[PDB]
Amino acid sequence: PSRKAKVKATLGEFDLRDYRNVEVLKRFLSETGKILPRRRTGLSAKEQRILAKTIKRARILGLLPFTEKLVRK
Amino acid sequence: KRQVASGRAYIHASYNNTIVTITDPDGNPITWSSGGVIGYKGSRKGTPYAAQLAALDAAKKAMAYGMQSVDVIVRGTGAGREQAIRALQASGLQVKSIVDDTPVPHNGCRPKKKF
Amino acid sequence: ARRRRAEVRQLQPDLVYGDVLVTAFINKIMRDGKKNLAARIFYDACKIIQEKTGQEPLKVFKQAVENVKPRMEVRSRRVGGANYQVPMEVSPRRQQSLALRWLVQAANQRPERRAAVRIAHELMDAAEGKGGAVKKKEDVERMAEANRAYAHYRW
């Protein structure tokens, strides 16, 4: 069911526009650098259109990765 | 020639072939092999039993240089992709970590007609 | 079939010894129903075998079967553009036929002049490891392996 836990509840509050909040914005990527599908995140219609141009910001400034490779795990 | 403890396994699985070049912690070609070197001539080469075979004859040239440990890397989705991966755990070689890193554009080149 | 699998024919256990395998062999000798022949064909092969390698002729049979019973076979098939000969494992009963089938088929391909004779020899010769019996067994475990190149199209 993909019914693990969306990342909206696994945190206190925060701002979606503070690019270098990388503790949080690591849990909005995958085991690739891919911005988590809206179903995983559980973000609003506004919210993940914001968190979109955020991790596109906090990428150019190196902080958050463009892609990874893969752990067979 | 020389001796090497830890070395890393590169696997390139196409459709018309599957290729294993094994190296050292830098990425330097110790021994390499694909199905077409095993004896396979045409469409023969892509079979999952060819991938099992390259990841033998390549991992055999590599114990010839005394190979102990391997980490694996794989490039593609192809016939018997993981059949070689297994063909290495089954050759007598510690499989460290196993990684996939497929060439993935972010949309640059228009592919050929045949998409 | 196309409504269910058959139950398989429940034979009369052997009249003399008692093995249900002994039965199916006698029938599997038999041609044109002439069953009182193939019973003698059988029970003269037990006079020869009990007296040429003096043990229990019955035990050799059991063994002369285990030794021709194949374990893998080429259950052929097709994709959509060409068709592949394909490795496949084998049923319990499928053995027991091809066993006896081949045991006979060799005995007729044997050169001797006599009936229960070419059974007697191709019964020792089966339970050795030579003779045409076992040759074919090890021949479709050989085309099980020298054709293992497509054991992903197996069903």
Added chain:
RNA sequence: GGUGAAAUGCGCAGAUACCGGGAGGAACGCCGAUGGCGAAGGCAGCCACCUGGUCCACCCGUGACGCUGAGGCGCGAAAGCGUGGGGAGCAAACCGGAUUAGAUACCCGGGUAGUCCACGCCCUAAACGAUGCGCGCUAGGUCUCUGGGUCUCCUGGGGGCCGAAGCUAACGCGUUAAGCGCGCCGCCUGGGGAGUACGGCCGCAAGGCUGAAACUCAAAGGAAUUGACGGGGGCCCGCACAAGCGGUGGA
């Protein structure tokens, strides 16, 4: 490497695979959604700047100033031309290999135009909701984006699906009307000939716009129904095939 299978092709002047560095062009993965915006063609990597439209709120302002528009003016994907740059990858024409009876194709290995930037042309399209443009009226239900409020819910603007009334040839439309009425626009008037000819008009050109007739046929059409049929699928059965025995074809 490539295919249904293969050869042209590239490699013992060292290819592929493999690590590190470098240049250059083209696009922008995940977020990307049945989602947004725009008049339309059309537009998504990230930043700033110069701007257009638009919705919500308070109802504060002038006070009918409003609608539509023949012609004129401007915008208009793709290919196409013109001068000059650029050319990674793709790739008409073209060069080969394979398939086939033949293959000027489907499949494979190269290849110029061209796609890319500019600046001027070209000004067509299944340019498509195939529904020109405003306003007023007529059950609602859920979904979805976006505004405002005494945010259990109320109320604006959007995009979707199902349905009242009613329309409709039927399909289907269905408060995003193809429902009920007002204004204005352009357009149709039987199929072929024909988007041709004649003439004017536009462009460098390729061509476009406007746009007939003579003659010939009783049709050309639209939805919809029962079948038949498919190298369309879904589900069953016959010794239909397979698993087994024995023959013909030969004498």
